[PDB]
Design a protein around this ligand. Structure first.
Ligand SMILES: Nc1ncnc2c1ncn2[C@@H]1O[C@H](COP(=O)(O)OP(=O)(O)O)[C@@H](O)[C@H]1O
Ligand SMILES: Nc1ncnc2c1ncn2[C@@H]1O[C@H](COP(=O)(O)OP(=O)(O)O)[C@@H](O)[C@H]1O
Ligand SMILES: CC(=O)N[C@@H](CCC(=O)O)C(=O)O
Ligand SMILES: CC(=O)N[C@@H](CCC(=O)O)C(=O)O
Ligand code: ALF
Ligand code: ALF
Ligand SMILES: [Mg+2]
Ligand SMILES: [Mg+2]
Lengths: 258, 258
């Protein structure tokens, strides 16, 4: 079978019915017109932030990662591994797509360990086994994977979805597309940056242009690009008219080179 | 492959580390000493009730089923399909069991439709396709299935775990064990009832002995027993010493006959 294509979904997309409909319409069109098997990895920080306020709990992010206390990992797991994942499975079902929801621990797809005691239950994702997902793909299912993982000792871990997507890409030897609320990485004037290299990323980071979750996003993309020896794109899921060309390889945001 | 055995987990078990440890110890022992493939189906009303109070939302059950408003289905899905499911996946991992988490919609394992507009997003579960789960079992994985499902139109549904377990049993032609906080169905004096028939169940229901979720539980068990033409047991997960014999077919609670 061909190298799969992982489409990572994140941002406020998950909270827009119209955006979800336009996205799945495009997914069906792609699936029915391409032999390359698809895999979806998703985040859902917005679903979490919303649930947190509903509980009046603060949200602190250190170096682009969400501090995840032991007293919050179960709730976060629920919002990400449960609500976010099953919402996407429901849209897949609505569009007659046979999908299967998974989290990083299923089939040890992506191995996770505690990244930093200061972050709590935040996991460091690394390549795992492609056996389960490859079998699902060969059988014609669309794996939809959340970014919650579990350590060999049985501790649930919250993994940044971009890093989770990159680790899965390495595991499956898959092409990768990171979809967000913005059209790629923006410069100091808020304009889209067409191409990105490690050198340029370092420069923009030194200058404070790339910050917060985008530093994590670009670092994950660069990691995937060098690991796969293939370009990785960071693009938007907002514009319906751009979705078809995007999924077909047309650069619509920021293309990470090696 | 042999007919699988579905072990349904529910009650406050999900909130006891000691109980979970004793259970998984017994599961590993069984798996390593029996060729019959295992499948876990789980509920988690307690995880939901706890999350609801955390949001100060009331919990109303009509005829043993939780009224599930549209404004609560996502939160419930998170607690059941996310937290509860992944907690069990974590314990499986801790005991070196290769498990795979699923919800009723994965592989259309169990078909669900809206049961009653008065209940909101509560689903009526019916047999689906055994293809996905059979393939997972043949490949050596332990499917751990939550009771959240999805309609063909893409609407998430909350299904009572006992009914979900029975529908899956029919789908897979599996033996079934329903584990709860009590040692089977109790009589008017709180004593365990060894055997149960449809006639006896009707009698006890008419007399008010069997009420609330137990009416749903016994009706689900009787349905499974007549559909499979096999006895179904309702037993407790509380007593560690009884777990081994229980999983080996020894009647430890209430055995439903036809
Ligand atoms: N230079 C930058 N270019 C583009 N987005 C940036 C930049 N610096 C910070 N961002 C922030 O990064 C966000 C996207 O990353 P993130 O918040 O992690 O969400 P997700 O990964 O779920 O899409 C944008 O919504 C933006 O607010
Ligand atoms: N006659 C009865 N015998 C046993 N349990 C009963 C009876 N009538 C009501 N129950 C209630 O049913 C409960 C078990 O069913 P339920 O609440 O649905 O939980 P679960 O299915 O998650 O184990 C018991 O904890 C008990 O409080
Ligand atoms: C550790 C960590 O930052 N996790 C992410 C996972 C979801 C996502 O990427 O949207 C988080 O917001 O909680
Ligand atoms: C509809 C319905 O009653 N659902 C169950 C599902 C979980 C279980 O059985 O514990 C519920 O409590 O929300
Ligand atoms: F949805 Al995100 F980081 F917020 F992947
Ligand atoms: F855990 Al339950 F009904 F409360 F299956
Ligand atoms: Mg991010
Ligand atoms: Mg019940």
């Amino acid at each position: 079978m061909m190298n799969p294509l992982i489409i990572k979904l994140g941002g406020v997309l998950l909270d827009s019915e119209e955006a979800l409909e336009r996205l799945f319409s495009a997914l069906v069109n792609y699936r029915e017109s391409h032999q390359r098997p698809l895999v979806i990895v998703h985040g859902g920080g917005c679903v979490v932030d919303e649930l947190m306020k509903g509980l009046n709990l603060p949200v602190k992010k250190k170096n682009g990662l969400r501090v995840t206390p032991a007293d919050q990992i179960d709730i976060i797991t629920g919002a990400l591994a449960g609500t976010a994942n099953k919402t996407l499975l429901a849209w897949a079902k609505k569009h007659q797509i046979a999908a299967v929801g998974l989290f990083l621990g299923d089939g040890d797809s992506v191995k996770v360990t505690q990244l930093d005691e200061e972050l709590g239950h935040v996991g460091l994702a690394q390549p795992g086994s492609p056996k389960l997902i490859n079998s699902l793909l060969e059988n014609g299912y669309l794996p939809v994977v959340s970014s919650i993982g579990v350590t060999d000792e049985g501790q649930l871990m919250n993994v940044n979805a971009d890093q989770a997507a990159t680790a899965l890409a390495a595991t499956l030897g898959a092409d990768l597309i990171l979809l967000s609320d913005v059209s790629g990485i923006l410069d100091g004037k808020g304009q889209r940056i067409a191409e990105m290299t490690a050198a340029k990323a370092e420069q923009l980071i030194e200058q404070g242009i790339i910050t917060d979750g985008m530093i994590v996003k670009v670092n994950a993309a660069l990691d995937a690009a060098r690991t796969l020896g293939r370009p990785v794109d960071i693009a938007s899921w907002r514009h319906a008219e751009q979705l078809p060309a995007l999924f077909n390889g047309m650069p619509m945001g920021t293309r990470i080179l090696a």
